[PDB]
Design a protein around this ligand. Sequence first.
Ligand SMILES: COc1ccc(Nc2nccc(-c3c[nH]nc3-c3cccnc3)n2)cc1
Length: 294
Amino acid sequence: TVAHQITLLECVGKGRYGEVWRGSWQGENVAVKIFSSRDEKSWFRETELYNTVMLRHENILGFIASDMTSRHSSTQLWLITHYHEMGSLYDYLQLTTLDTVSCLRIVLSIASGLAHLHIEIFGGKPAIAHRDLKSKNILVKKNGQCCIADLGLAVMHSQSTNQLDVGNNPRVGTKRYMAPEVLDETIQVDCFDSYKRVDIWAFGLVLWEVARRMVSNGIVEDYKPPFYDVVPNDPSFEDMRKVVCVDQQRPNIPNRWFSDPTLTSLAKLMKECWYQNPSARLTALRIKKTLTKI
Ligand SMILES: COc1ccc(Nc2nccc(-c3c[nH]nc3-c3cccnc3)n2)cc1
């Protein structure tokens, strides 16, 4: 099994989900996600998605293997993928600023990965919603494009059967990026499009995160996570509910963006991701089309 051939080298990420390690396999870097015992259903769902859906795409993290192994005489669930030395988009945006070309390339590549996920393809894949899009779940590739990672919460739908497959995972999305209908708990869980629009909301927040780091008129904003100014680290459910639903707050558009053609376009995009009413938001394909034009 691939797990027994890998040498773990250093831990590059850690959370309640478990750990991500840079490992060595066949003399190349690979990412090894070692799930915690509390998050076995995410391992199962990711393994299911990668093994039963043809998911290869330039902007979707590339799957190598999924294994059960023994470490310290007890079972570990491993998910092995391609390694991206440039790291997560979250970490990357803190280490550099962007120019116009690099900013558009990042957000367009994310829109292409997302649209590919959302679209059903025949002759071939079901439609897939992600449900935990965020800059920590997006990796930066050496060519300046990004790829979307972590399918542990994904939901699938296929037209031939009209079957919705929401999995069996008690994990919920990252609270900071949850759409209003998730926080007020009125989202219609029996309908696939409900989940696509939860992704669109989160993608709006990612767009905002990246745009702040594009230089115009020689100035740039510091990296900040969405809603940094109004919720603490690790915000609770009620924190996000108060800010997003009750007070209807949205991320602030800096004045300097409106003096730049690109950032004004991006600002209109993200605002149409943020309607309180999910039906009003743009779709991934519409966002991809618009971004390709700018
Ligand atoms: C600054 O320190 C760092 C340097 C490099 C990296 N490189 C990297 N390469 C591939 C994947 C991931 C990753 C991040 N989040 N989740 C995954 C993942 C991995 C496997 C399966 N599913 C999700 N990170 C990370 C941190």
